[PDB]
Every structure is written in structure tokens, then in C-alpha cells.
Amino acid sequence: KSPALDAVVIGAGVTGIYQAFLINQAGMKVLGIEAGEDVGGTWYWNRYPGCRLDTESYAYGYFALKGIIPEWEWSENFASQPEMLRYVNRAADAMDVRKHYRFNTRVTAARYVENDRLWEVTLDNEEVVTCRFLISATGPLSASRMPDIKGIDSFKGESFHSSRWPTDAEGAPKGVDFTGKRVGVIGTGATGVQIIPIAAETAKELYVFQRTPNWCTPLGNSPMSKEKMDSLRNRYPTILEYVKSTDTAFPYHRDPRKGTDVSESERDAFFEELYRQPGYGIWLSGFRDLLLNKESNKFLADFVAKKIRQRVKDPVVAEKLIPKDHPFGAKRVPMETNYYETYNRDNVHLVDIREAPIQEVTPEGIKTADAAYDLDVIIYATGFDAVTGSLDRIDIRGKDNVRLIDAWAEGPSTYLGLQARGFPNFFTLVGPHNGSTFCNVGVCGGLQAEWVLRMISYMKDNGFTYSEPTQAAENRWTEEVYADFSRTLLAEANAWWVKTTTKPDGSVVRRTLVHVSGGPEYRKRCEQVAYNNYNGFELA
Ligand SMILES: Cc1cc2nc3c(=O)[nH]c(=O)nc-3n(C[C@H](O)[C@H](O)[C@H](O)COP(=O)(O)OP(=O)(O)OC[C@H]3O[C@@H](n4cnc5c(N)ncnc54)[C@H](O)[C@@H]3O)c2cc1C
Ligand SMILES: NC(=O)c1ccc[n+]([C@@H]2O[C@H](COP(=O)([O-])OP(=O)(O)OC[C@H]3O[C@@H](n4cnc5c(N)ncnc54)[C@H](OP(=O)(O)O)[C@@H]3O)[C@@H](O)[C@H]2O)c1
């Protein structure tokens, strides 16, 4: 029993469609499967007000950089979701990729057949296809999660998670006009932070329910003249080479200097300039020791904090938005268009819901431990189940009928962030130990799929039909990803990222759900392994 397809690719976001294009371009049989109507993933699903890149548009647009759609015109330095969706669409045209996809179809299970070295893939609990290789491009941040919060279904008004905003026939979102409504927004991650200022322009009243402020910096978006766009296009080969060489694939790189290498007065001048220029420079061009040295982090934390107080006129309000939990740049930093100034409006109220938690949602509004709020509308900007989440929702079974869920219970275990022992011929793209959290995913995802294609090509060419990490390679990779991660300041910030298992005999295993070496050093490890005939995989 031999498989119908060389590969199934799950997902039609930017990673999936590109992976599918490469496999077919290499002369192989691929089937792509997508739950939504059409291409885009993130940019198909997220139609909330303010949705917009945090990556420079020309940097994220790997399909333009690579010469698949070089003629592409960006209208803004940080494109909005609608523009991003037209981008993914136009690229799906050039790649002629849609004819390889089933849409409106959800993978519900995937079972590795040991005797036949193949994957049985189940579609909406009915049809079953077979493939040599299973490749998930299921997304690091798809799979919305609701707040665990009592009474959700009683609200008598309109109610959404931010990733499921209803639209008109044209694709444009509806119920965007809040004129004369009282609006609740729960959550202040990068999603809430984009919505709240747009909500505030039309809402009669606006309540923001914040469990934990983030460090947010100004985005500094503006339009992109045709002249500048032509200029960028002309230097695409330089820009590409440059983003392939930085640690995050953003067009920034760390200052060579330590924080304490300049006076206090020089830091401030330096911080002041980056703060004012657009994009992630303030975070990504910082001092080399920004995420490794408590004191060097406090310099910048102190500085952004001072900026929050300058921008928010009310001092009690302003201190509630300054975080005390965590170091700056310890999470993907949300960037904003007039976020703080919004709280100077008369119709906008910040509700600290850590000191006074929500009890329940009510037919009339929301109820906290010390107040009630009549609300006409509620927006759940409460985030996603990250990296591993979209995989958990598929019943994935490997050798010996073992659940991926159970294999990764003590935390994700991979080789190269790409395969897992127990799960042969299975590739996880922009999953764990891969670096997604701080990546320009447009670029990182792209390069990861090219590497997977090269390994698939190698096997076809050698007539191999079996690949799986050795236990030793996977142990060494996984331990090493953790060691590097323990050396930065992210370790005591987000301890939920670390899973710690004191087994029953006394042994202690530590895994992080997050890779933090640079992309270049990652890709270098992958090429050393690829060239040395995939040293670390059993290949047969
Ligand atoms: C609002 C938002 C803004 C972002 N902005 C940036 C940014 O500016 N820069 C950056 O680098 N990153 C950004 N990201 C991260 C983002 O995840 C990546 O840029 C990128 O879009 C991920 O692409 P992907 O193809 O890997 O996954 P996705 O875009 O998440 O697509 C995965 C697809 O798989 C589908 N799927 C999942 N399970 C199944 C199944 N069981 N069966 C069938 N289909 C399934 C989903 O429907 C989805 O379409 C942003 C993310 C969000 C949510
Ligand atoms: N390019 C962009 O501008 C952009 C835009 C959107 C998203 N993204 C990406 O998507 C990721 C997720 O961002 P997100 O804003 O969608 O989600 P998120 O960052 O995880 O934030 C969810 C928010 O809801 C709050 N929340 C979670 N559970 C809650 C509960 N049970 N009750 C009340 N409040 C709760 C969280 O608070 P706690 O911290 O207390 O849990 C948090 O502030 C980001 O890291 C970013 O990488 C990027």
C-alpha cells in the first residue's frame, strides 16, 4: 500500500501556500487543505479594526523579495489587513497554487501507518487521503481562545472574539460603527491595542478591561510614495540579503555596544531618537545586552515608562498602563497608533481587572468584584492558543498509536524544530523551537519551507521513504534550545513558556516552548545537518 500523494500541506496562510508551491514546483504530488474559503490564514481570518503589520511591509513580503511577485505595490510602510489579504491573494495567483487546495475542509485526524510508512489524513471526520509526508502549516497563532469566564452566552448585545468579526459580501467588516454604543474590550495585547483607539473615535463610552499592561511603542506608520516603493524594489536584492542576516529577519540589528558603555545622557539621546523613528528599532536596534542584562533592560524600561507618563495626562491612569511584571521586549512588543492618547478622551475608562477580577458576564454587561458595567457591545481581544495549539486540535497519532498531545505533554520535543521522535515523515512549520515568537514570519517561514522542500527532494532522489529523529539528536537539540533560552531574561519573565517535570524516579526535565537563537544561527545548524546527509535523522 503506497500513498496517493507525496505530501499534504495543512494550512493556506503564507507558510502553507508557499510550501505547497515549492513541492509542486519540484515535480511532486501535493494536496493542500484549508478550513477557510480561500488563502491568507492570519490575513483571511483577522478582520478587526486596526489590524496591521508590525513588520515593515517590504520586509514581510517575502513573495515580492523573492521574485514571485516583484511588481507588487505597497501603499504604506506597515500594511493594513485588507492590503495584506490582497497581497497573499495576488501571490496565490502567481504561484497557481489554489488548484492544489481543498478549501472549507478541516483536517480532524492524522494517523501514521507503520507498515506502509505513510500518513492517513482524515477530512471533516469522513474522507481519508494518503501521503508520504504530512506537513503542518497550521499557524503559530491560529486557534482562538476564549476567556475562561462565566456567563458569556447571556449577553443580550453584540459579541465577538477579535479573530471572528462578521463581514459584508465585499469582505469589509461590519458593526465597525459604534456611534451611540457603550463598548467593552477585554485584553490589551497587540490586538486590543490596535482596536481601542479606533473604537474610541465613535463609541459613546469605552471600557477597557486590562489584566496586564504591555510595553507598547509607537508604530509611526505613514504612506509610501510610489517613488520610495520603486526605490525599495530596486534594492530588493540587498534588502533580502540583509534580512536573511539579522537575528529576527526584521530589518534591524543590535547595536554593538553594551548599555553601560555610554553615559546616562547618551543613552537617553539614543533612546529618544529610536523612540521617534518608525517600527521596531527601539526594541531591535537596542544595546546588545538588552535581553541579557537586568540593568540594561531597566534603562530602556525606565525610558519607555517616562514616555507613557508624557503621553497620558492623568497620573493615576498613566501608572496603571506601565508594567511592573516584566522586562521590556520580553514579549513581542505591541506597536500602536495613538494608543496612550486615547485614554485622555473623556469617553474612555481603564478598568484594572487584576486587582478587581471579572466575576461573570451578564445580560446587561460585565460584573467585577466592585462594579457593574452596562454594555451594548463586547470585544474579546483575549488572544490565541500559541504555537502548539492548532496542532492540539487535530487528533495526530504516531508510532504505537501515540498522541502528539501526550508525546509533548512534558513540553515540545523536536529535532531542528521540524520533526518529533515517534512521528515519522511529519513536518511542523513555524511551530516550536522554530523562532516564530520574535520572527519576521514572512521571511523565517519562507526559508523554513525551502529547507523542508530540499529534504523532501533528497529523499525522493535517494528513494528514501522514512525519516525520524534519533532520540539522542532530539534530546541534544531540545536541551540546547533550553540552555540558550535560560541565559536571557525571558526565562523568569514568562515562566509558563518553561515546562518543568520532576519525573517519578527523581529526574528533572526542562523544556521551553520558544526558540531564541537568531535565525541565521538556526539556519546554519539546519544546513550543517542537511549537508552531512541529515545527520540526526534515521533515514531509510
Ligand atoms: C493579528 C496578527 C498580526 C500579525 N502580524 C505579524 C507581523 O506583522 N509580522 C510577523 O512576522 N508575524 C505576524 N503575525 C504572526 C503570523 O502568525 C504570521 O505572520 C503568519 O501569518 C503565519 O502564517 P502561517 O501560514 O504559518 O499561519 P496562518 O496564517 O495562521 O495560517 C494557518 C492556516 O491553517 C488553517 N488550519 C489550521 N488547522 C487546520 C485544520 N485542522 N484543517 C484545515 N485547516 C487548518 C487555518 O485556518 C489557517 O488558515 C501576526 C499574527 C496575527 C494573528
Ligand atoms: N502585527 C500586529 O500588530 C499584531 C496584531 C495582533 C496580534 N499579533 C500577534 O498575535 C499575538 C497575540 O496577540 P493578541 O493581542 O491577539 O493576544 P495576546 O497578546 O495573548 O493578549 C490577550 C489579552 O487578553 C487578556 N486575557 C487573556 N485571557 C484573559 C481572561 N481569561 N480574562 C480576561 N483577560 C484575558 C490577556 O491578559 P494576560 O497577559 O493577563 O493573560 C492579554 O492582554 C501577539 O503576540 C502578536 O505576536 C500581532
mmCIF file of N, CA and C in Angstrom, residues 31-136:
data_model
loop_
_atom_site.group_PDB
_atom_site.id
_atom_site.type_symbol
_atom_site.label_atom_id
_atom_site.label_comp_id
_atom_site.label_asym_id
_atom_site.label_seq_id
_atom_site.Cartn_x
_atom_site.Cartn_y
_atom_site.Cartn_z
ATOM 1 N N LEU A 31 -1.265 17.863 -1.820
ATOM 2 C CA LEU A 31 -2.627 18.289 -1.536
ATOM 3 C C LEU A 31 -2.602 19.272 -0.375
ATOM 4 N N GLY A 32 -3.138 20.462 -0.588
ATOM 5 C CA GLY A 32 -3.292 21.445 0.475
ATOM 6 C C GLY A 32 -4.723 21.495 0.973
ATOM 7 N N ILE A 33 -4.882 21.601 2.294
ATOM 8 C CA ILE A 33 -6.167 21.531 2.977
ATOM 9 C C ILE A 33 -6.334 22.806 3.810
ATOM 10 N N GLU A 34 -7.451 23.506 3.647
ATOM 11 C CA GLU A 34 -7.710 24.738 4.408
ATOM 12 C C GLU A 34 -9.176 24.849 4.816
ATOM 13 N N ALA A 35 -9.355 25.104 6.105
ATOM 14 C CA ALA A 35 -10.637 25.329 6.737
ATOM 15 C C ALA A 35 -11.456 26.548 6.220
ATOM 16 N N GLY A 36 -10.780 27.626 5.854
ATOM 17 C CA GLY A 36 -11.482 28.806 5.364
ATOM 18 C C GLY A 36 -11.778 28.735 3.877
ATOM 19 N N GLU A 37 -12.459 29.760 3.373
ATOM 20 C CA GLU A 37 -12.898 29.773 1.972
ATOM 21 C C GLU A 37 -11.766 29.904 0.938
ATOM 22 N N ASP A 38 -10.590 30.377 1.371
ATOM 23 C CA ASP A 38 -9.541 30.890 0.471
ATOM 24 C C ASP A 38 -8.231 31.208 1.246
ATOM 25 N N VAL A 39 -7.215 31.725 0.549
ATOM 26 C CA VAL A 39 -5.878 31.896 1.078
ATOM 27 C C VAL A 39 -5.731 33.081 2.055
ATOM 28 N N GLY A 40 -4.700 33.052 2.898
ATOM 29 C CA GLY A 40 -4.366 34.214 3.734
ATOM 30 C C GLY A 40 -4.061 33.907 5.187
ATOM 31 N N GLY A 41 -4.675 32.849 5.708
ATOM 32 C CA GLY A 41 -4.544 32.481 7.114
ATOM 33 C C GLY A 41 -4.818 33.705 7.963
ATOM 34 N N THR A 42 -3.810 34.119 8.726
ATOM 35 C CA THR A 42 -3.884 35.317 9.542
ATOM 36 C C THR A 42 -4.667 36.451 8.853
ATOM 37 N N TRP A 43 -4.376 36.715 7.574
ATOM 38 C CA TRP A 43 -4.925 37.848 6.828
ATOM 39 C C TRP A 43 -6.279 37.579 6.170
ATOM 40 N N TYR A 44 -6.661 36.317 6.119
ATOM 41 C CA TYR A 44 -8.023 35.951 5.813
ATOM 42 C C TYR A 44 -8.909 36.039 7.066
ATOM 43 N N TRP A 45 -8.433 35.502 8.195
ATOM 44 C CA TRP A 45 -9.231 35.417 9.426
ATOM 45 C C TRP A 45 -9.340 36.678 10.288
ATOM 46 N N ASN A 46 -8.312 37.495 10.375
ATOM 47 C CA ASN A 46 -8.378 38.606 11.313
ATOM 48 C C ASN A 46 -8.863 39.956 10.778
ATOM 49 N N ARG A 47 -10.161 40.224 10.784
ATOM 50 C CA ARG A 47 -10.616 41.447 10.091
ATOM 51 C C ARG A 47 -11.020 42.590 11.027
ATOM 52 N N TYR A 48 -10.494 42.553 12.247
ATOM 53 C CA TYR A 48 -10.760 43.591 13.237
ATOM 54 C C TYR A 48 -10.223 44.989 12.859
ATOM 55 N N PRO A 49 -10.803 46.047 13.469
ATOM 56 C CA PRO A 49 -10.418 47.423 13.154
ATOM 57 C C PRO A 49 -9.029 47.684 13.684
ATOM 58 N N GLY A 50 -8.171 48.183 12.796
ATOM 59 C CA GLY A 50 -6.797 48.480 13.138
ATOM 60 C C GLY A 50 -5.805 47.367 12.826
ATOM 61 N N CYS A 51 -6.293 46.199 12.439
ATOM 62 C CA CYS A 51 -5.363 45.118 12.171
ATOM 63 C C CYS A 51 -4.313 45.563 11.147
ATOM 64 N N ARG A 52 -3.034 45.433 11.513
ATOM 65 C CA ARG A 52 -1.935 45.924 10.681
ATOM 66 C C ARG A 52 -0.578 45.312 11.113
ATOM 67 N N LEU A 53 0.344 45.141 10.155
ATOM 68 C CA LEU A 53 1.650 44.519 10.404
ATOM 69 C C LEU A 53 2.403 45.263 11.483
ATOM 70 N N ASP A 54 3.327 44.567 12.138
ATOM 71 C CA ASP A 54 4.343 45.214 12.952
ATOM 72 C C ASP A 54 5.684 45.102 12.227
ATOM 73 N N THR A 55 5.697 44.385 11.102
ATOM 74 C CA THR A 55 6.884 44.266 10.269
ATOM 75 C C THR A 55 6.738 45.223 9.110
ATOM 76 N N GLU A 56 7.780 45.976 8.787
ATOM 77 C CA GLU A 56 7.811 46.772 7.562
ATOM 78 C C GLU A 56 7.296 45.915 6.407
ATOM 79 N N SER A 57 6.447 46.508 5.571
ATOM 80 C CA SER A 57 5.680 45.762 4.571
ATOM 81 C C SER A 57 6.603 45.118 3.569
ATOM 82 N N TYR A 58 7.599 45.881 3.141
ATOM 83 C CA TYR A 58 8.562 45.385 2.184
ATOM 84 C C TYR A 58 9.468 44.291 2.809
ATOM 85 N N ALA A 59 9.611 44.271 4.132
ATOM 86 C CA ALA A 59 10.357 43.188 4.799
ATOM 87 C C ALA A 59 9.558 41.879 4.933
ATOM 88 N N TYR A 60 8.295 42.005 5.306
ATOM 89 C CA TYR A 60 7.413 40.859 5.484
ATOM 90 C C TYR A 60 7.109 40.157 4.146
ATOM 91 N N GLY A 61 7.026 40.944 3.068
ATOM 92 C CA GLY A 61 6.647 40.487 1.733
ATOM 93 C C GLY A 61 7.730 39.688 1.004
ATOM 94 N N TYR A 62 8.008 38.524 1.558
ATOM 95 C CA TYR A 62 8.979 37.607 1.015
ATOM 96 C C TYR A 62 8.635 37.177 -0.425
ATOM 97 N N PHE A 63 7.357 37.185 -0.789
ATOM 98 C CA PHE A 63 6.955 36.801 -2.147
ATOM 99 C C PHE A 63 7.353 37.842 -3.175
ATOM 100 N N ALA A 64 7.295 39.104 -2.765
ATOM 101 C CA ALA A 64 7.854 40.194 -3.554
ATOM 102 C C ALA A 64 9.406 40.170 -3.559
ATOM 103 N N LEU A 65 10.058 40.180 -2.381
ATOM 104 C CA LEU A 65 11.529 39.992 -2.294
ATOM 105 C C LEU A 65 12.074 38.868 -3.175
ATOM 106 N N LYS A 66 11.414 37.719 -3.192
ATOM 107 C CA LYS A 66 11.936 36.568 -3.877
ATOM 108 C C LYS A 66 11.785 36.550 -5.387
ATOM 109 N N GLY A 67 10.935 37.424 -5.931
ATOM 110 C CA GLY A 67 10.760 37.473 -7.378
ATOM 111 C C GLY A 67 9.549 36.708 -7.852
ATOM 112 N N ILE A 68 8.731 36.238 -6.921
ATOM 113 C CA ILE A 68 7.452 35.654 -7.305
ATOM 114 C C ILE A 68 6.462 36.747 -7.752
ATOM 115 N N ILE A 69 6.312 37.818 -6.959
ATOM 116 C CA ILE A 69 5.535 38.993 -7.374
ATOM 117 C C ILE A 69 6.295 40.323 -7.169
ATOM 118 N N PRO A 70 7.486 40.483 -7.793
ATOM 119 C CA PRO A 70 8.283 41.695 -7.551
ATOM 120 C C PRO A 70 7.578 43.016 -7.898
ATOM 121 N N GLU A 71 6.632 42.979 -8.837
ATOM 122 C CA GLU A 71 5.901 44.200 -9.230
ATOM 123 C C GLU A 71 4.958 44.764 -8.137
ATOM 124 N N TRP A 72 4.723 43.987 -7.084
ATOM 125 C CA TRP A 72 3.822 44.398 -6.001
ATOM 126 C C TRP A 72 4.022 45.818 -5.493
ATOM 127 N N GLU A 73 2.920 46.538 -5.339
ATOM 128 C CA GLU A 73 2.953 47.907 -4.827
ATOM 129 C C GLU A 73 2.368 47.955 -3.415
ATOM 130 N N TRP A 74 3.168 48.383 -2.434
ATOM 131 C CA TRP A 74 2.684 48.627 -1.066
ATOM 132 C C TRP A 74 2.276 50.085 -0.928
ATOM 133 N N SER A 75 1.170 50.345 -0.268
ATOM 134 C CA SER A 75 0.751 51.740 -0.183
ATOM 135 C C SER A 75 1.229 52.424 1.120
ATOM 136 N N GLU A 76 1.652 51.601 2.101
ATOM 137 C CA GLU A 76 2.019 52.046 3.459
ATOM 138 C C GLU A 76 3.231 51.260 3.984
ATOM 139 N N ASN A 77 4.018 51.921 4.815
ATOM 140 C CA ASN A 77 5.157 51.309 5.481
ATOM 141 C C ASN A 77 4.814 50.107 6.371
ATOM 142 N N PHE A 78 3.551 50.000 6.791
ATOM 143 C CA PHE A 78 3.035 48.898 7.626
ATOM 144 C C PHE A 78 1.605 48.548 7.193
ATOM 145 N N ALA A 79 1.458 47.644 6.234
ATOM 146 C CA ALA A 79 0.151 47.436 5.586
ATOM 147 C C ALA A 79 -0.945 46.920 6.502
ATOM 148 N N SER A 80 -2.148 47.386 6.209
ATOM 149 C CA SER A 80 -3.346 47.011 6.891
ATOM 150 C C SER A 80 -3.748 45.623 6.420
ATOM 151 N N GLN A 81 -4.537 44.925 7.228
ATOM 152 C CA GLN A 81 -5.060 43.601 6.853
ATOM 153 C C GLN A 81 -5.652 43.471 5.450
ATOM 154 N N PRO A 82 -6.575 44.402 5.032
ATOM 155 C CA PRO A 82 -7.135 44.268 3.667
ATOM 156 C C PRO A 82 -6.037 44.246 2.613
ATOM 157 N N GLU A 83 -5.037 45.096 2.791
ATOM 158 C CA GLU A 83 -3.949 45.164 1.821
ATOM 159 C C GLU A 83 -3.129 43.877 1.891
ATOM 160 N N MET A 84 -2.877 43.386 3.105
ATOM 161 C CA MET A 84 -2.191 42.090 3.299
ATOM 162 C C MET A 84 -2.930 40.934 2.608
ATOM 163 N N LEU A 85 -4.250 40.897 2.728
ATOM 164 C CA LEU A 85 -5.057 39.871 2.043
ATOM 165 C C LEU A 85 -4.993 39.957 0.531
ATOM 166 N N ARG A 86 -4.947 41.169 -0.027
ATOM 167 C CA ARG A 86 -4.748 41.325 -1.490
ATOM 168 C C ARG A 86 -3.343 40.846 -1.872
ATOM 169 N N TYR A 87 -2.383 40.962 -0.942
ATOM 170 C CA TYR A 87 -1.020 40.572 -1.208
ATOM 171 C C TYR A 87 -0.978 39.046 -1.275
ATOM 172 N N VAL A 88 -1.439 38.384 -0.224
ATOM 173 C CA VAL A 88 -1.470 36.935 -0.219
ATOM 174 C C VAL A 88 -2.227 36.429 -1.444
ATOM 175 N N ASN A 89 -3.347 37.074 -1.798
ATOM 176 C CA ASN A 89 -4.168 36.676 -2.964
ATOM 177 C C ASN A 89 -3.402 36.740 -4.285
ATOM 178 N N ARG A 90 -2.743 37.864 -4.516
ATOM 179 C CA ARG A 90 -2.001 38.095 -5.749
ATOM 180 C C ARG A 90 -0.872 37.100 -5.907
ATOM 181 N N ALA A 91 -0.264 36.710 -4.773
ATOM 182 C CA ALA A 91 0.822 35.755 -4.738
ATOM 183 C C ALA A 91 0.306 34.365 -4.993
ATOM 184 N N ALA A 92 -0.871 34.043 -4.466
ATOM 185 C CA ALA A 92 -1.546 32.762 -4.741
ATOM 186 C C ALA A 92 -1.912 32.643 -6.238
ATOM 187 N N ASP A 93 -2.206 33.771 -6.874
ATOM 188 C CA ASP A 93 -2.327 33.793 -8.345
ATOM 189 C C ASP A 93 -0.991 33.425 -9.010
ATOM 190 N N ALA A 94 0.050 34.216 -8.766
ATOM 191 C CA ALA A 94 1.342 33.928 -9.389
ATOM 192 C C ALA A 94 1.799 32.490 -9.161
ATOM 193 N N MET A 95 1.544 31.926 -7.987
ATOM 194 C CA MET A 95 2.043 30.581 -7.711
ATOM 195 C C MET A 95 1.142 29.511 -8.288
ATOM 196 N N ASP A 96 0.009 29.921 -8.876
ATOM 197 C CA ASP A 96 -1.015 28.987 -9.387
ATOM 198 C C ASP A 96 -1.297 27.863 -8.361
ATOM 199 N N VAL A 97 -1.419 28.230 -7.097
ATOM 200 C CA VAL A 97 -1.453 27.240 -6.019
ATOM 201 C C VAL A 97 -2.856 26.738 -5.605
ATOM 202 N N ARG A 98 -3.902 27.479 -5.941
ATOM 203 C CA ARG A 98 -5.214 27.150 -5.403
ATOM 204 C C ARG A 98 -5.777 25.836 -5.927
ATOM 205 N N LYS A 99 -5.415 25.478 -7.154
ATOM 206 C CA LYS A 99 -5.885 24.223 -7.727
ATOM 207 C C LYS A 99 -5.331 22.992 -6.966
ATOM 208 N N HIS A 100 -4.348 23.202 -6.093
ATOM 209 C CA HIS A 100 -3.799 22.117 -5.269
ATOM 210 C C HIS A 100 -4.475 22.036 -3.884
ATOM 211 N N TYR A 101 -5.414 22.939 -3.620
ATOM 212 C CA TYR A 101 -6.082 23.011 -2.325
ATOM 213 C C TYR A 101 -7.536 22.571 -2.305
ATOM 214 N N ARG A 102 -7.942 21.906 -1.218
ATOM 215 C CA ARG A 102 -9.347 21.787 -0.832
ATOM 216 C C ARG A 102 -9.574 22.865 0.203
ATOM 217 N N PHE A 103 -10.572 23.712 -0.022
ATOM 218 C CA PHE A 103 -10.998 24.687 0.952
ATOM 219 C C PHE A 103 -12.254 24.237 1.658
ATOM 220 N N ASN A 104 -12.639 24.970 2.711
ATOM 221 C CA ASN A 104 -13.838 24.637 3.513
ATOM 222 C C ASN A 104 -13.760 23.218 4.075
ATOM 223 N N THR A 105 -12.542 22.831 4.414
ATOM 224 C CA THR A 105 -12.252 21.479 4.787
ATOM 225 C C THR A 105 -11.269 21.539 5.927
ATOM 226 N N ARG A 106 -11.590 20.813 6.988
ATOM 227 C CA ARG A 106 -10.775 20.818 8.182
ATOM 228 C C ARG A 106 -10.206 19.430 8.417
ATOM 229 N N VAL A 107 -8.892 19.326 8.568
ATOM 230 C CA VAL A 107 -8.298 18.050 8.995
ATOM 231 C C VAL A 107 -8.658 17.774 10.471
ATOM 232 N N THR A 108 -9.185 16.576 10.734
ATOM 233 C CA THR A 108 -9.653 16.212 12.071
ATOM 234 C C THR A 108 -8.735 15.175 12.728
ATOM 235 N N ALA A 109 -7.935 14.496 11.924
ATOM 236 C CA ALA A 109 -7.073 13.445 12.450
ATOM 237 C C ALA A 109 -6.031 13.076 11.428
ATOM 238 N N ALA A 110 -4.922 12.530 11.899
ATOM 239 C CA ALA A 110 -3.845 12.085 11.039
ATOM 240 C C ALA A 110 -3.184 10.907 11.715
ATOM 241 N N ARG A 111 -3.155 9.770 11.044
ATOM 242 C CA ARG A 111 -2.622 8.549 11.636
ATOM 243 C C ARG A 111 -1.507 8.022 10.787
ATOM 244 N N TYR A 112 -0.330 7.899 11.397
ATOM 245 C CA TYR A 112 0.802 7.297 10.757
ATOM 246 C C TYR A 112 0.614 5.781 10.685
ATOM 247 N N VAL A 113 0.728 5.241 9.466
ATOM 248 C CA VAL A 113 0.659 3.781 9.208
ATOM 249 C C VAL A 113 2.083 3.172 9.191
ATOM 250 N N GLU A 114 2.509 2.521 10.271
ATOM 251 C CA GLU A 114 3.897 1.999 10.368
ATOM 252 C C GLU A 114 4.287 1.002 9.258
ATOM 253 N N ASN A 115 3.388 0.092 8.914
ATOM 254 C CA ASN A 115 3.694 -0.904 7.898
ATOM 255 C C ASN A 115 3.910 -0.288 6.523
ATOM 256 N N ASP A 116 3.301 0.872 6.279
ATOM 257 C CA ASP A 116 3.315 1.433 4.927
ATOM 258 C C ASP A 116 4.054 2.757 4.814
ATOM 259 N N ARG A 117 4.571 3.250 5.943
ATOM 260 C CA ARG A 117 5.373 4.473 6.011
ATOM 261 C C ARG A 117 4.636 5.650 5.413
ATOM 262 N N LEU A 118 3.434 5.911 5.904
ATOM 263 C CA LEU A 118 2.588 6.935 5.297
ATOM 264 C C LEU A 118 1.591 7.475 6.285
ATOM 265 N N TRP A 119 0.934 8.545 5.848
ATOM 266 C CA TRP A 119 0.020 9.244 6.689
ATOM 267 C C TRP A 119 -1.363 9.138 6.092
ATOM 268 N N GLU A 120 -2.289 8.608 6.896
ATOM 269 C CA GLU A 120 -3.700 8.625 6.615
ATOM 270 C C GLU A 120 -4.237 9.913 7.215
ATOM 271 N N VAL A 121 -4.784 10.786 6.374
ATOM 272 C CA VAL A 121 -5.268 12.099 6.800
ATOM 273 C C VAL A 121 -6.785 12.156 6.635
ATOM 274 N N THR A 122 -7.488 12.413 7.739
ATOM 275 C CA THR A 122 -8.970 12.389 7.766
ATOM 276 C C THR A 122 -9.574 13.813 7.658
ATOM 277 N N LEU A 123 -10.542 13.973 6.765
ATOM 278 C CA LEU A 123 -11.104 15.282 6.426
ATOM 279 C C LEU A 123 -12.503 15.355 6.947
ATOM 280 N N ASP A 124 -12.813 16.382 7.726
ATOM 281 C CA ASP A 124 -14.142 16.520 8.359
ATOM 282 C C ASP A 124 -14.729 15.175 8.795
ATOM 283 N N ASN A 125 -13.891 14.370 9.457
ATOM 284 C CA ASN A 125 -14.298 13.075 10.013
ATOM 285 C C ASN A 125 -14.925 12.130 8.967
ATOM 286 N N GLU A 126 -14.591 12.324 7.693
ATOM 287 C CA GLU A 126 -15.167 11.492 6.642
ATOM 288 C C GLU A 126 -14.131 10.923 5.687
ATOM 289 N N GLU A 127 -13.757 11.690 4.657
ATOM 290 C CA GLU A 127 -12.808 11.198 3.654
ATOM 291 C C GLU A 127 -11.382 11.024 4.223
ATOM 292 N N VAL A 128 -10.607 10.129 3.604
ATOM 293 C CA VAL A 128 -9.247 9.825 4.029
ATOM 294 C C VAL A 128 -8.365 9.831 2.798
ATOM 295 N N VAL A 129 -7.325 10.654 2.820
ATOM 296 C CA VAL A 129 -6.304 10.618 1.790
ATOM 297 C C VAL A 129 -5.006 10.070 2.369
ATOM 298 N N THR A 130 -4.099 9.635 1.496
ATOM 299 C CA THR A 130 -2.805 9.153 1.961
ATOM 300 C C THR A 130 -1.667 9.994 1.397
ATOM 301 N N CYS A 131 -0.609 10.165 2.182
ATOM 302 C CA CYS A 131 0.531 10.941 1.743
ATOM 303 C C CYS A 131 1.785 10.413 2.399
ATOM 304 N N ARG A 132 2.893 10.529 1.681
ATOM 305 C CA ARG A 132 4.166 10.137 2.219
ATOM 306 C C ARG A 132 4.487 11.053 3.426
ATOM 307 N N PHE A 133 4.330 12.359 3.213
ATOM 308 C CA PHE A 133 4.696 13.360 4.194
ATOM 309 C C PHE A 133 3.546 14.230 4.637
ATOM 310 N N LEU A 134 3.465 14.448 5.941
ATOM 311 C CA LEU A 134 2.477 15.359 6.462
ATOM 312 C C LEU A 134 3.213 16.611 6.880
ATOM 313 N N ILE A 135 2.731 17.750 6.420
ATOM 314 C CA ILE A 135 3.352 18.994 6.731
ATOM 315 C C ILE A 135 2.305 19.942 7.296
ATOM 316 N N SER A 136 2.456 20.305 8.566
ATOM 317 C CA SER A 136 1.527 21.242 9.132
ATOM 318 C C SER A 136 2.077 22.640 9.022
#
